[PDB]
Paper text:
The Hippo signaling pathway and its components mainly function to control cell number and maintain organ size from early development through to adulthood. The downstream transcriptional machinery, which consists of YAP, TAZ (transcription co-activators) and TEAD (transcription factor), is the terminal effector of the pathway. Formation of the YAP/TAZ-TEAD complex leads to the expression of genes involved in cell proliferation and anti-apoptosis, such as Axl, CTGF, and Birc5/Survivin. More importantly, the YAP/TAZ-TEAD complex is likely a central effector of several converging pathways, due to crosstalk between Hippo and other signaling pathways, such as MAPK, Wnt/β-Catenin, and TGF-β. Hence, the YAP/TAZ-TEAD complex, specifically its protein-protein interactions, presents a formidable target in the development of new cancer therapeutics.
Numbering used by the authors:
A (entry chain B): 209 to 245, 253 to 427
B (entry chain A): 210 to 245, 252 to 300, 303 to 426
């Protein structure tokens, strides 16, 4: 009730970044969004069904199947203050780490919704490595999908942050992590976005979704 | 004076939303509309290569092949003041005229923030009328990408925001003689949203080097 964790799986790290080679040896790594990990604040899941309305297979159906301790909402304030010109010397990447007390094979589903419609669905199977009494699932510098690279470039073309925020009111991502054998939902994370108001600095706020 | 080469000219072009209100009453909202003596203003085609499809088969290559008199830029102020909340038909219509009986190939490419997102290709056929030859597209369905795009623009709170988005949105239409492969007309389209009370408007330019 302190972090993005169920009984069987927890997020340690998540990041999306732009890495720009300045020299043969020297690199700038700009973090668009970044989580690295007292009680979490709570949000009743009915407050967010309007942004994730979906019928069959949707958030509501997933939540009702449970377990109710697997469901989180993350709000990101994305830092878009970075140069995106010189494409050749740029790598858009994602990294993440999860941890479990047991050796599971997991299925990770990511759905991106834009103005109501599902625009991307990515499904991957991940496998653990034993490390320090636990089982670790680690993605290191995987390429950011092209949709998201192009979305960032579109946001940055807008002349005012308030326009970026208007667009982002209609943008969500839903991540569902499932045990491949048991089909148990291990983690389900709903993500919403604004652009960070600050000149430089990504922020996040994590909530535990409830229904009480 | 108008969108015309030696071998083909546009008479009419429209995109519309038709909403049947009862058995005999319908609303027809025009998003954009051209119906057609001073000279057209000119635009250097190098200014617009970055907004259109480049590389093999791209605007630059097409322009250099010529003929140079076949190339036009149309700016639309699209009228988005209409209800888009079931009984609706989103449609496109157009008419062309030629002095010769050709089979024509119409290619339409939609480009969004650099990338080609839709390509449509159609073959159209002539009808003789009074020593010339007429081509007509009547109530062809607007592609799903464009409907949706309209619906997304209409969710935005401000027309200036809609116009910022539209700066990186273009459509390229290339009309070719199917048998000779001659370029008959090439029209680059760019967009703004029309202001309140305004309706649909357009401005036509002749692309040059
Ligand atoms: O979704 C799109 O492709 C674009 C858009 C998306 C993100 C930023 C700027 C424009 N759009 C169009 C209408 C609302 C957003």
């Amino acid at each position: 009730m302190r972090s993005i964790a169920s009984s069987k799986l927890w997020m340690l790290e998540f990041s999306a970044f732009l890495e720009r080679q300045q020299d043969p040896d020297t690199y700038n790594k700009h973090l668009f969004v970044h989580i690295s990990q007292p009680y979490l604040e709570t949000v009743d899941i009915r407050q967010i069904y309007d942004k994730f309305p979906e019928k069959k297979g949707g958030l509501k159906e997933l939540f009702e199947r449970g377990p109710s301790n697997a469901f989180f909402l993350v709000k990101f304030w994305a830092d878009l203050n970075t140069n995106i010109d010189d494409e050749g010397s740029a790598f858009y990447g994602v990294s993440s780490q999860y941890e479990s007390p047991e050796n599971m094979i997991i299925t990770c589903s990511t759905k991106v919704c834009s103005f109501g419609k599902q625009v991307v669905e990515k499904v991957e199977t991940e496998y653990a490595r034993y490390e320090n009494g636990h089982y670790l699932y680690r993605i290191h510098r995987s390429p950011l999908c092209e949709y998201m690279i192009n979305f960032i470039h579109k946001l940055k073309h807008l002349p005012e942050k308030y326009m970026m925020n208007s667009v982002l009111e209609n943008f969500t991502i839903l991540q569902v992590v499932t045990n491949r054998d048991t089909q148990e939902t291990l983690l389900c994370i709903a993500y919403v976005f604004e652009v960070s108001a600050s000149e430089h600095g990504a922020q996040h706020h994590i909530y535990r979704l409830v229904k009480e």
